[PDB]
Design a protein around this ligand. Structure first.
Ligand SMILES: C[C@H]1[C@H](C)CC[C@]2(C(=O)O)CC[C@]3(C)C(=CC[C@@H]4[C@@]5(C)CC[C@H](O)C(C)(C)[C@@H]5CC[C@]43C)[C@H]12
Length: 222
């Protein structure tokens, strides 16, 4: 690569993400005072466990649609094999969705956006795994504690998928090359932004996996 490709790619990554940022950040924060009420909350609480889990899967799956198309615009991804273009997504794509959830997270009230409004963890009282839900909130918290920006998201999220160490890969070299020119662009852009400090304030590599992995297993009931 070259000093300019280095820039060209970040911009290209900041490009692809913007198209796939699912929701307008602009519109997101604006809806602060729009908060659920006890009755509606008490309403949502009432439904059986069978309903919410599915309701979640809607917002979930639909969100993951964006995550995939994000992967495409990226260089070298297109010139990758059929078998190997999926393997990463299998593990990766789930994890990224959770990452984007931080945007819908406000630490000033411990709530997350959902179905038009913001709501606390008690909105999922009916899921029977309060511990699970909470850990996700605690994950979002740490990310909100990072005061994260769009263009680092685009760059973090990208490396999640491009893990050449995801087992089941056949064309292993080609991906590492994508990874190397991705690992570089991130830090490089971070160094250009002096945000290298948060790199020690980042989740361990096993946490987000252990989150999503153990997350989907309970879901693998439906
Ligand atoms: C990921 C974001 C997306 C960036 C845009 C906002 C989002 C949406 O599309 O509505 C808000 C709701 C959550 C956070 C979203 C989808 C999944 C989550 C999820 C179901 C994730 C799994 C968790 O267990 C939990 C139940 C806390 C959330 C609920 C909020 C939801 C349903 C969307």
């Amino acid at each position: 690569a070259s000093l300019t490709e280095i820039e060209h790619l970040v911009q290209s990554v900041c490009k692809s993400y913007r198209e796939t940022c699912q929701l307008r950040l602009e519109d997101l924060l604006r809806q602060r005072s729009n908060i659920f009420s006890r009755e509606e909350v008490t309403g949502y609480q009432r439904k059986s466990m069978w309903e919410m889990w599915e309701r979640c899967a809607h917002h979930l799956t639909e969100a993951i649609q964006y995550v995939v198309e994000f992967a495409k615009r990226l260089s070298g991804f297109m010139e990758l094999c059929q078998n190997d273009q999926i393997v990463l997504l299998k593990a990766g794509a789930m994890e990224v969705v959770l990452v984007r959830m931080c945007r819908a997270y406000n630490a000033d009230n411990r709530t997350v956006f959902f179905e038009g409004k913001y709501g606390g963890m008690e909105l999922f009282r009916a899921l029977g795994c309060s511990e699970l839900i909470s850990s996700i909130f605690d994950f979002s918290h740490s990310l909100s504690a990072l005061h994260f920006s769009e263009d680092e998201i685009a760059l973090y999220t990208a490396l999640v998928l491009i893990n050449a160490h995801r087992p089941g890969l056949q064309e292993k070299r080609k991906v590492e090359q994508l990874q190397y020119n991705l690992e570089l662009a991130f830090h490089h852009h971070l160094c250009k932004t002096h945000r290298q400090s948060i790199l020690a304030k980042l989740p361990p590599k096993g946490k987000l996996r252990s989150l999503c992995s153990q997350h989907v297993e309970r879901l693998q009931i439906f």
